[PDB]
Amino acid sequence: HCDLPCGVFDPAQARIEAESVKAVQEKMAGNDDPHFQTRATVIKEQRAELAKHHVSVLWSDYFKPPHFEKYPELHQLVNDTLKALSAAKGSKDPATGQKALDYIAQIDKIFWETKKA
Amino acid sequence: HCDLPCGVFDPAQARIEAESVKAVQEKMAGNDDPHFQTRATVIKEQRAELAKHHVSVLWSDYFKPPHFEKYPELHQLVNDTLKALSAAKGSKDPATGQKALDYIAQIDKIFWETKK
Amino acid sequence: HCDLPCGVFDPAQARIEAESVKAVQEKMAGNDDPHFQTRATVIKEQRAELAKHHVSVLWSDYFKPPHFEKYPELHQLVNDTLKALSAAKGSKDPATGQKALDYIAQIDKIFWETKKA
Amino acid sequence: HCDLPCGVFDPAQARIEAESVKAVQEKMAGNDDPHFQTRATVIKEQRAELAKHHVSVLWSDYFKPPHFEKYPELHQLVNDTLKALSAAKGSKDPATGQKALDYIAQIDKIFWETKKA
Amino acid sequence: HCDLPCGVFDPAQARIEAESVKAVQEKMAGNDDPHFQTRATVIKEQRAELAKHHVSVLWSDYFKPPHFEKYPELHQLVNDTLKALSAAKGSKDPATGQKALDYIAQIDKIFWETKK
Amino acid sequence: HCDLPCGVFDPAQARIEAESVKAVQEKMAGNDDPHFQTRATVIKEQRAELAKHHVSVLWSDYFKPPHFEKYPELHQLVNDTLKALSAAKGSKDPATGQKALDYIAQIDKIFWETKKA
Ligand SMILES: [Cl-]
Ligand SMILES: [Cl-]
Ligand SMILES: [Cl-]
Ligand SMILES: [Cl-]
Ligand SMILES: [Cl-]
Ligand SMILES: [Cl-]
Ligand code: NI
Ligand code: NI
Ligand code: NI
Ligand code: NI
Ligand code: NI
Ligand code: NI
């Protein structure tokens, strides 16, 4: 995940940040205080950016030609995942955070299949 | 974990980073090229620091006074965990990586108990 | 402070960042411009976060088991200081920035004693 | 490039970092001092990582479905560019930096065609 | 620009970041949604800070005493440029973004003269 | 120091980071372990870089045109300090860390005068 390569990767890193994104979006419906809303927006932006970075590192550093060969939809899925995270940044609606998580979940299934044997 | 509070924590964040530290240590044992050794040292330093931040965060942002009362040894455990990580930082021996992982696993145990 | 170890520590690093937090809280009371309010919120989150990092570093990298023996309340003190910094992140009230300073002043008092003996 | 979106992007950001990567690799053949070699390796790693981040941001934030439609090789080219930057990180040979630059150059031509009308 | 020295500099790094500042200012004028305004404010602050770092770097790491002698006004220009960027940070008016861009263009002019 | 402006500045931030630089240079003379030498090199690059940021910040965000009028050599002084910090990044010799400190001490002297009048 660090590009040594160390060969340690886990889509859980991207998932956990994306789970924070959604958690924040949900908290934003419960407290209309301007200061709270602003801190939530600041922190959402950061966690969504870290999520994007973890997704991108998987795609660049972990996934290799035989994976792209076996999963020809994987390039586009990764791109759709990043754009869903951007749409989450730009939105207070938890449905957008959830969409990002659903995409990451497709990445995680593919990841673990490639880790098998 | 982002201090909103957002309420999402998982010691897996510390864990995966400390696993990377150990993995890098293991690889340093295999290949003595100076350039590689240096890159491994750079990376190990980053990963260990990240792991420390995650551990420090659980301690300050997740754990609360009722937990420190029920687990009177938790402050020292977290301190020892951070010191273990500093020691893995300073070392190429994967056993130091593993010691940090062992301490993290003690924290994870407590963490999931408090989730019940 | 850099974990080499280099042996250069000073709670002044935590203190100056916590002073910035309090000073930003004080400025927010003087200008209701929503853009200023938002920038102040961005800056206060960052500074408070750096203050927490400096405080954690002292506890993990400077203080050692004999210090914890001699000051059995140091563990809880450091935890309280970080929670006070998080409470100031979440607030516009300078009294919260002050409270974080109060705790930092207690750590600073212990620190300099350990530099004597 | 910041994901507002601000709509300001330029592959020159990724190019300039990748030009530093190569410059460092070339400087590494001229001075065998261990300390110099170490600082060069440290700085190479950083600039290659920033290059990767600029390439990834183009792919995720600037490029859109009609671009991927018109350039069906663009996903793979971006992936090859990132791996070339990783191979540059892992290498003292300026030919690896140059390969990363040749890839970025293909991205830059495509970028500017999509910016036309 | 990375302090090796690597010898690669281009005021385009400051420029593109300051162009992003101005672009964000322009967009703030178009859409008064609070969430959007906040995100624009977050981003503008980051981009402006990055631009400052690039400018400060040219000044310390690229420019040398012979340049400061040939261009006695360069120290003040760079200082003014950083202050312009701080002012764009504090403002939603794209004219402040443009002022910072104008100062950067003065630096770029001098920079390319010294490359000849 | 955070560009709000918040009005909290102290050259002690630059000073403590430059002390770390010098202290790391001194440690490198005491332990020839190649792994230690490399970590010391990593840490010294980072600390020196933070010191340069703190020095630049004072010059850009704290000092103002009347200060530059009263101290016409302040511009060159700040430039010299940053070049001295870069020279210490590039060196193992503590004399270079010391020189960076010497310059910082001169800025600190001017700073506190401007806090009086
Ligand atoms: Cl890797
Ligand atoms: Cl939290
Ligand atoms: Cl230390
Ligand atoms: Cl964008
Ligand atoms: Cl340079
Ligand atoms: Cl300020
Ligand atoms: Ni890795
Ligand atoms: Ni959180
Ligand atoms: Ni240190
Ligand atoms: Ni942008
Ligand atoms: Ni450079
Ligand atoms: Ni400030």
Side-chain angles (χ1 to χ4, degrees):
Chain A
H1 74 338
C2 45
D3 210 355
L4 179 66
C6 71
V8 59
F9 290 96
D10 189 338
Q13 293 192 294
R15 182 200 175 163
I16 291 159
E17 297 299 345
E19 243 137 37
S20 299
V21 167
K22 188 184 167 227
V24 170
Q25 291 175 323
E26 293 174 332
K27 291 196 157 211
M28 296 176 85
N31 181 355
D32 63 350
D33 176 65
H35 182 64
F36 182 77
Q37 284 286 307
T38 297
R39 293 190 54 246
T41 303
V42 162
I43 290 175
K44 180 155 69 57
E45 200 78 10
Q46 297 165 163
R47 308 330 292 201
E49 181 74 347
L50 283 162
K52 289 175 61 185
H53 171 77
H54 296 306
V55 169
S56 171
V57 161
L58 284 174
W59 182 62
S60 71
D61 295 12
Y62 174 74
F63 292 115
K64 296 229 188 322
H67 302 133
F68 298 123
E69 243 214 276
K70 181 167 173 178
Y71 305 88
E73 80 284 11
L74 180 62
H75 293 319
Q76 190 63 51
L77 165 63
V78 169
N79 198 266
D80 288 352
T81 301
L82 297 178
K83 283 173 164 63
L85 292 161
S86 299
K89 273 180 175 165
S91 177
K92 305 182 288 184
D93 176 7
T96 67
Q98 186 61 51
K99 189 55 168 160
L101 286 161
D102 293 345
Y103 280 121
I104 289 169
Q106 302 184 67
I107 297 175
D108 187 267
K109 180 151 179 302
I110 292 179
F111 180 85
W112 291 113
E113 278 168 27
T114 65
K115 289 282 261 168
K116 181 169 192 175
Chain B
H1 69 351
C2 45
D3 227 351
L4 179 67
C6 79
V8 2
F9 294 90
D10 192 331
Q13 302 188 287
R15 204 192 62 249
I16 299 158
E17 291 302 345
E19 291 175 357
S20 297
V21 171
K22 194 190 175 175
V24 170
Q25 282 167 336
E26 281 166 353
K27 291 159 167 299
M28 299 179 84
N31 170 359
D32 49 20
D33 179 56
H35 189 65
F36 183 82
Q37 292 287 318
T38 298
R39 298 190 49 252
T41 300
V42 163
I43 290 168
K44 177 160 56 67
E45 203 82 5
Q46 280 163 176
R47 301 294 113 183
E49 180 74 351
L50 280 176
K52 287 174 79 201
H53 171 74
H54 298 309
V55 173
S56 178
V57 161
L58 293 169
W59 187 63
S60 64
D61 295 16
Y62 173 77
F63 293 116
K64 310 287 208 230
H67 307 128
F68 298 118
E69 169 158 358
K70 188 185 199 199
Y71 304 93
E73 82 284 0
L74 182 63
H75 292 322
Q76 191 62 53
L77 173 59
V78 170
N79 194 272
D80 285 343
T81 305
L82 298 173
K83 283 173 165 64
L85 282 159
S86 291
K89 251 181 196 175
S91 187
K92 308 186 283 197
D93 177 6
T96 64
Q98 186 59 47
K99 195 188 199 176
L101 290 167
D102 289 340
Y103 276 120
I104 293 170
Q106 285 164 118
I107 301 176
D108 176 273
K109 177 176 194 211
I110 295 181
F111 180 86
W112 294 102
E113 278 158 32
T114 66
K115 303 289 296 225
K116 308 183 188 331
Chain C
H1 73 337
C2 46
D3 220 350
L4 176 63
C6 74
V8 183
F9 289 95
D10 187 344
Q13 303 190 276
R15 181 186 49 76
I16 187 143
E17 300 301 341
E19 275 167 7
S20 288
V21 164
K22 187 187 180 185
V24 172
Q25 292 170 324
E26 291 164 338
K27 305 270 188 221
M28 302 176 81
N31 175 0
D32 71 328
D33 183 37
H35 186 233
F36 183 75
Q37 292 287 312
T38 301
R39 296 183 56 243
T41 303
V42 163
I43 295 157
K44 163 165 74 72
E45 205 76 9
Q46 300 169 329
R47 301 297 143 169
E49 178 73 355
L50 287 172
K52 290 177 83 186
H53 169 80
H54 292 315
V55 166
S56 193
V57 164
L58 287 167
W59 179 63
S60 68
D61 296 7
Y62 174 76
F63 292 117
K64 289 182 153 64
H67 306 310
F68 297 130
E69 253 255 284
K70 190 174 206 258
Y71 303 94
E73 77 297 352
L74 181 57
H75 286 327
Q76 193 54 58
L77 174 52
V78 169
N79 197 264
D80 286 348
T81 301
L82 297 181
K83 292 163 150 74
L85 286 165
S86 297
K89 252 186 202 165
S91 176
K92 295 186 302 177
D93 180 357
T96 63
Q98 188 54 52
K99 181 51 72 195
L101 293 157
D102 292 342
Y103 284 120
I104 290 173
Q106 287 161 31
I107 297 176
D108 181 271
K109 174 182 174 141
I110 293 161
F111 179 87
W112 293 107
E113 287 174 5
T114 71
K115 294 297 218 174
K116 294 154 73 284
Chain D
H1 74 338
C2 45
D3 210 355
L4 179 66
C6 71
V8 59
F9 290 96
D10 189 338
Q13 293 192 294
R15 182 200 175 163
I16 291 159
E17 297 299 345
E19 243 137 37
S20 299
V21 167
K22 188 184 167 227
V24 170
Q25 291 175 323
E26 293 174 332
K27 291 196 157 211
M28 296 176 85
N31 181 355
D32 63 350
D33 176 65
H35 182 64
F36 182 77
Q37 284 286 307
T38 297
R39 293 190 54 246
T41 303
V42 162
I43 290 175
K44 180 155 69 57
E45 200 78 10
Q46 297 165 163
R47 308 330 292 201
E49 181 74 347
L50 283 162
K52 289 175 61 185
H53 171 77
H54 296 306
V55 169
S56 171
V57 161
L58 284 174
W59 182 62
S60 71
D61 295 12
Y62 174 74
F63 292 115
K64 296 229 188 322
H67 302 133
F68 298 123
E69 243 214 276
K70 181 167 173 178
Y71 305 88
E73 80 284 11
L74 180 62
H75 293 319
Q76 190 63 51
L77 165 63
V78 169
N79 198 266
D80 288 352
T81 301
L82 297 178
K83 283 173 164 63
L85 292 161
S86 299
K89 273 180 175 165
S91 177
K92 305 182 288 184
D93 176 7
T96 67
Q98 186 61 51
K99 189 55 168 160
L101 286 161
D102 293 345
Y103 280 121
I104 289 169
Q106 302 184 67
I107 297 175
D108 187 267
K109 180 151 179 302
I110 292 179
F111 180 85
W112 291 113
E113 278 168 27
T114 65
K115 289 282 261 168
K116 181 169 192 175
Chain E
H1 69 351
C2 45
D3 227 351
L4 179 67
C6 79
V8 2
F9 294 90
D10 192 331
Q13 302 188 287
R15 204 192 62 249
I16 299 158
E17 291 302 345
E19 291 175 357
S20 297
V21 171
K22 194 190 175 175
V24 170
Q25 282 167 336
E26 281 166 353
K27 291 159 167 299
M28 299 179 84
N31 170 359
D32 49 20
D33 179 56
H35 189 65
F36 183 82
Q37 292 287 318
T38 298
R39 298 190 49 252
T41 300
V42 163
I43 290 168
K44 177 160 56 67
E45 203 82 5
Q46 280 163 176
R47 301 294 113 183
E49 180 74 351
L50 280 176
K52 287 174 79 201
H53 171 74
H54 298 309
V55 173
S56 178
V57 161
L58 293 169
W59 187 63
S60 64
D61 295 16
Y62 173 77
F63 293 116
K64 310 287 208 230
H67 307 128
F68 298 118
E69 169 158 358
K70 188 185 199 199
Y71 304 93
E73 82 284 0
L74 182 63
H75 292 322
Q76 191 62 53
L77 173 59
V78 170
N79 194 272
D80 285 343
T81 305
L82 298 173
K83 283 173 165 64
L85 282 159
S86 291
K89 251 181 196 175
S91 187
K92 308 186 283 197
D93 177 6
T96 64
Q98 186 59 47
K99 195 188 199 176
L101 290 167
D102 289 340
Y103 276 120
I104 293 170
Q106 285 164 118
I107 301 176
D108 176 273
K109 177 176 194 211
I110 295 181
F111 180 86
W112 294 102
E113 278 158 32
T114 66
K115 303 289 296 225
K116 308 183 188 331
Chain F
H1 73 337
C2 46
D3 220 350
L4 176 63
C6 74
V8 183
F9 289 95
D10 187 344
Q13 303 190 276
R15 181 186 49 76
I16 187 143
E17 300 301 341
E19 275 167 7
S20 288
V21 164
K22 187 187 180 185
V24 172
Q25 292 170 324
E26 291 164 338
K27 305 270 188 221
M28 302 176 81
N31 175 0
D32 71 328
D33 183 37
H35 186 233
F36 183 75
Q37 292 287 312
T38 301
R39 296 183 56 243
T41 303
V42 163
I43 295 157
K44 163 165 74 72
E45 205 76 9
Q46 300 169 329
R47 301 297 143 169
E49 178 73 355
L50 287 172
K52 290 177 83 186
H53 169 80
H54 292 315
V55 166
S56 193
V57 164
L58 287 167
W59 179 63
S60 68
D61 296 7
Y62 174 76
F63 292 117
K64 289 182 153 64
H67 306 310
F68 297 130
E69 253 255 284
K70 190 174 206 258
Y71 303 94
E73 77 297 352
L74 181 57
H75 286 327
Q76 193 54 58
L77 174 52
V78 169
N79 197 264
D80 286 348
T81 301
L82 297 181
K83 292 163 150 74
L85 286 165
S86 297
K89 252 186 202 165
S91 176
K92 295 186 302 177
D93 180 357
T96 63
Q98 188 54 52
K99 181 51 72 195
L101 293 157
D102 292 342
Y103 284 120
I104 290 173
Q106 287 161 31
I107 297 176
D108 181 271
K109 174 182 174 141
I110 293 161
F111 179 87
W112 293 107
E113 287 174 5
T114 71
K115 294 297 218 174
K116 294 154 73 284

PDB file of all heavy atoms in Angstrom, chain D residues 37-52:
ATOM      1  N   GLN D  37      23.223  10.148  -1.600  1.00  0.00           N
ATOM      2  CA  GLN D  37      22.504   9.085  -2.281  1.00  0.00           C
ATOM      3  C   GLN D  37      21.209   8.873  -1.505  1.00  0.00           C
ATOM      4  O   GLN D  37      20.186   8.712  -2.107  1.00  0.00           O
ATOM      5  CB  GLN D  37      23.332   7.778  -2.318  1.00  0.00           C
ATOM      6  CG  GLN D  37      24.497   7.780  -3.365  1.00  0.00           C
ATOM      7  CD  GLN D  37      23.999   7.644  -4.767  1.00  0.00           C
ATOM      8  OE1 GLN D  37      23.255   6.718  -5.066  1.00  0.00           O
ATOM      9  NE2 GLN D  37      24.350   8.596  -5.638  1.00  0.00           N
ATOM     10  N   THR D  38      21.288   8.921  -0.171  1.00  0.00           N
ATOM     11  CA  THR D  38      20.110   8.746   0.682  1.00  0.00           C
ATOM     12  C   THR D  38      19.108   9.883   0.543  1.00  0.00           C
ATOM     13  O   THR D  38      17.906   9.634   0.486  1.00  0.00           O
ATOM     14  CB  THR D  38      20.484   8.595   2.167  1.00  0.00           C
ATOM     15  OG1 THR D  38      21.275   7.414   2.324  1.00  0.00           O
ATOM     16  CG2 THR D  38      19.222   8.488   3.037  1.00  0.00           C
ATOM     17  N   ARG D  39      19.591  11.131   0.533  1.00  0.00           N
ATOM     18  CA  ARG D  39      18.686  12.292   0.380  1.00  0.00           C
ATOM     19  C   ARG D  39      18.034  12.227  -1.003  1.00  0.00           C
ATOM     20  O   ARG D  39      16.841  12.544  -1.165  1.00  0.00           O
ATOM     21  CB  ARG D  39      19.438  13.630   0.472  1.00  0.00           C
ATOM     22  CG  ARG D  39      20.004  13.910   1.841  1.00  0.00           C
ATOM     23  CD  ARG D  39      20.535  15.318   2.023  1.00  0.00           C
ATOM     24  NE  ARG D  39      19.514  16.293   1.670  1.00  0.00           N
ATOM     25  CZ  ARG D  39      19.598  17.114   0.640  1.00  0.00           C
ATOM     26  NH1 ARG D  39      20.697  17.105  -0.108  1.00  0.00           N
ATOM     27  NH2 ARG D  39      18.578  17.945   0.348  1.00  0.00           N
ATOM     28  N   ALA D  40      18.828  11.863  -2.004  1.00  0.00           N
ATOM     29  CA  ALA D  40      18.268  11.736  -3.370  1.00  0.00           C
ATOM     30  C   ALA D  40      17.151  10.708  -3.385  1.00  0.00           C
ATOM     31  O   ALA D  40      16.139  10.941  -4.038  1.00  0.00           O
ATOM     32  CB  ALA D  40      19.352  11.326  -4.375  1.00  0.00           C
ATOM     33  N   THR D  41      17.350   9.572  -2.720  1.00  0.00           N
ATOM     34  CA  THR D  41      16.360   8.463  -2.730  1.00  0.00           C
ATOM     35  C   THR D  41      15.066   8.959  -2.030  1.00  0.00           C
ATOM     36  O   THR D  41      13.950   8.733  -2.514  1.00  0.00           O
ATOM     37  CB  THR D  41      16.935   7.228  -2.013  1.00  0.00           C
ATOM     38  OG1 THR D  41      18.159   6.853  -2.663  1.00  0.00           O
ATOM     39  CG2 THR D  41      15.949   6.018  -1.992  1.00  0.00           C
ATOM     40  N   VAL D  42      15.235   9.664  -0.912  1.00  0.00           N
ATOM     41  CA  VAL D  42      14.094  10.238  -0.103  1.00  0.00           C
ATOM     42  C   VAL D  42      13.222  11.221  -0.931  1.00  0.00           C
ATOM     43  O   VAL D  42      11.998  11.170  -0.922  1.00  0.00           O
ATOM     44  CB  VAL D  42      14.635  11.023   1.138  1.00  0.00           C
ATOM     45  CG1 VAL D  42      13.550  11.982   1.736  1.00  0.00           C
ATOM     46  CG2 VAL D  42      15.176  10.071   2.200  1.00  0.00           C
ATOM     47  N   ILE D  43      13.906  12.113  -1.631  1.00  0.00           N
ATOM     48  CA  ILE D  43      13.287  13.164  -2.395  1.00  0.00           C
ATOM     49  C   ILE D  43      12.658  12.589  -3.684  1.00  0.00           C
ATOM     50  O   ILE D  43      11.578  13.016  -4.096  1.00  0.00           O
ATOM     51  CB  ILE D  43      14.353  14.257  -2.728  1.00  0.00           C
ATOM     52  CG1 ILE D  43      14.750  15.023  -1.430  1.00  0.00           C
ATOM     53  CG2 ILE D  43      13.869  15.166  -3.927  1.00  0.00           C
ATOM     54  CD1 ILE D  43      15.880  16.053  -1.607  1.00  0.00           C
ATOM     55  N   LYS D  44      13.345  11.616  -4.306  1.00  0.00           N
ATOM     56  CA  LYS D  44      12.791  10.912  -5.470  1.00  0.00           C
ATOM     57  C   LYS D  44      11.445  10.279  -5.125  1.00  0.00           C
ATOM     58  O   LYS D  44      10.471  10.347  -5.904  1.00  0.00           O
ATOM     59  CB  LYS D  44      13.771   9.858  -5.977  1.00  0.00           C
ATOM     60  CG  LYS D  44      13.256   9.073  -7.185  1.00  0.00           C
ATOM     61  CD  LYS D  44      14.424   8.493  -8.055  1.00  0.00           C
ATOM     62  CE  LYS D  44      15.197   7.385  -7.363  1.00  0.00           C
ATOM     63  NZ  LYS D  44      14.396   6.169  -6.898  1.00  0.00           N
ATOM     64  N   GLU D  45      11.399   9.655  -3.956  1.00  0.00           N
ATOM     65  CA  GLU D  45      10.199   8.919  -3.528  1.00  0.00           C
ATOM     66  C   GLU D  45       9.040   9.895  -3.412  1.00  0.00           C
ATOM     67  O   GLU D  45       7.906   9.583  -3.845  1.00  0.00           O
ATOM     68  CB  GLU D  45      10.466   8.216  -2.203  1.00  0.00           C
ATOM     69  CG  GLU D  45       9.525   7.053  -1.881  1.00  0.00           C
ATOM     70  CD  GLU D  45       9.853   5.739  -2.632  1.00  0.00           C
ATOM     71  OE1 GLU D  45      10.935   5.611  -3.290  1.00  0.00           O
ATOM     72  OE2 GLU D  45       8.997   4.833  -2.576  1.00  0.00           O
ATOM     73  N   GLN D  46       9.314  11.043  -2.789  1.00  0.00           N
ATOM     74  CA  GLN D  46       8.289  12.089  -2.610  1.00  0.00           C
ATOM     75  C   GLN D  46       7.804  12.653  -3.902  1.00  0.00           C
ATOM     76  O   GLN D  46       6.608  12.776  -4.076  1.00  0.00           O
ATOM     77  CB  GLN D  46       8.757  13.245  -1.739  1.00  0.00           C
ATOM     78  CG  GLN D  46       9.059  12.804  -0.372  1.00  0.00           C
ATOM     79  CD  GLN D  46       9.875  13.808   0.454  1.00  0.00           C
ATOM     80  OE1 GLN D  46       9.912  13.690   1.683  1.00  0.00           O
ATOM     81  NE2 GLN D  46      10.556  14.764  -0.214  1.00  0.00           N
ATOM     82  N   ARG D  47       8.718  13.053  -4.801  1.00  0.00           N
ATOM     83  CA  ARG D  47       8.260  13.678  -6.036  1.00  0.00           C
ATOM     84  C   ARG D  47       7.495  12.679  -6.954  1.00  0.00           C
ATOM     85  O   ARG D  47       6.581  13.078  -7.673  1.00  0.00           O
ATOM     86  CB  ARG D  47       9.430  14.293  -6.824  1.00  0.00           C
ATOM     87  CG  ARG D  47      10.402  15.272  -6.058  1.00  0.00           C
ATOM     88  CD  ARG D  47       9.782  16.073  -4.909  1.00  0.00           C
ATOM     89  NE  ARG D  47       8.818  17.071  -5.326  1.00  0.00           N
ATOM     90  CZ  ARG D  47       8.467  18.125  -4.582  1.00  0.00           C
ATOM     91  NH1 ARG D  47       9.044  18.326  -3.397  1.00  0.00           N
ATOM     92  NH2 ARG D  47       7.561  18.998  -5.026  1.00  0.00           N
ATOM     93  N   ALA D  48       7.904  11.406  -6.964  1.00  0.00           N
ATOM     94  CA  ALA D  48       7.216  10.389  -7.745  1.00  0.00           C
ATOM     95  C   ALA D  48       5.786  10.185  -7.192  1.00  0.00           C
ATOM     96  O   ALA D  48       4.863  10.047  -7.978  1.00  0.00           O
ATOM     97  CB  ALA D  48       7.970   9.057  -7.703  1.00  0.00           C
ATOM     98  N   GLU D  49       5.639  10.175  -5.859  1.00  0.00           N
ATOM     99  CA  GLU D  49       4.317  10.090  -5.238  1.00  0.00           C
ATOM    100  C   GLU D  49       3.408  11.281  -5.590  1.00  0.00           C
ATOM    101  O   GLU D  49       2.206  11.095  -5.822  1.00  0.00           O
ATOM    102  CB  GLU D  49       4.457   9.988  -3.724  1.00  0.00           C
ATOM    103  CG  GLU D  49       3.101   9.876  -2.997  1.00  0.00           C
ATOM    104  CD  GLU D  49       2.421   8.481  -3.157  1.00  0.00           C
ATOM    105  OE1 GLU D  49       2.844   7.634  -4.023  1.00  0.00           O
ATOM    106  OE2 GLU D  49       1.460   8.265  -2.379  1.00  0.00           O
ATOM    107  N   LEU D  50       3.967  12.496  -5.621  1.00  0.00           N
ATOM    108  CA  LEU D  50       3.170  13.648  -5.989  1.00  0.00           C
ATOM    109  C   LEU D  50       2.802  13.542  -7.468  1.00  0.00           C
ATOM    110  O   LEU D  50       1.689  13.881  -7.832  1.00  0.00           O
ATOM    111  CB  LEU D  50       3.954  14.949  -5.773  1.00  0.00           C
ATOM    112  CG  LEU D  50       4.129  15.514  -4.368  1.00  0.00           C
ATOM    113  CD1 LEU D  50       5.287  16.477  -4.461  1.00  0.00           C
ATOM    114  CD2 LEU D  50       2.833  16.211  -3.820  1.00  0.00           C
ATOM    115  N   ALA D  51       3.756  13.120  -8.317  1.00  0.00           N
ATOM    116  CA  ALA D  51       3.435  12.886  -9.728  1.00  0.00           C
ATOM    117  C   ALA D  51       2.247  11.921  -9.843  1.00  0.00           C
ATOM    118  O   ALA D  51       1.346  12.168 -10.620  1.00  0.00           O
ATOM    119  CB  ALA D  51       4.615  12.339 -10.504  1.00  0.00           C
ATOM    120  N   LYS D  52       2.287  10.812  -9.125  1.00  0.00           N
ATOM    121  CA  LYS D  52       1.200   9.798  -9.194  1.00  0.00           C
ATOM    122  C   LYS D  52      -0.127  10.402  -8.795  1.00  0.00           C
ATOM    123  O   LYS D  52      -1.182  10.139  -9.426  1.00  0.00           O
ATOM    124  CB  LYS D  52       1.498   8.571  -8.315  1.00  0.00           C
ATOM    125  CG  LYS D  52       2.635   7.730  -8.929  1.00  0.00           C
ATOM    126  CD  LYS D  52       3.076   6.560  -8.054  1.00  0.00           C
ATOM    127  CE  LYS D  52       1.965   5.552  -7.782  1.00  0.00           C
ATOM    128  NZ  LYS D  52       2.364   4.484  -6.826  1.00  0.00           N
TER     129      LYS D  52
END
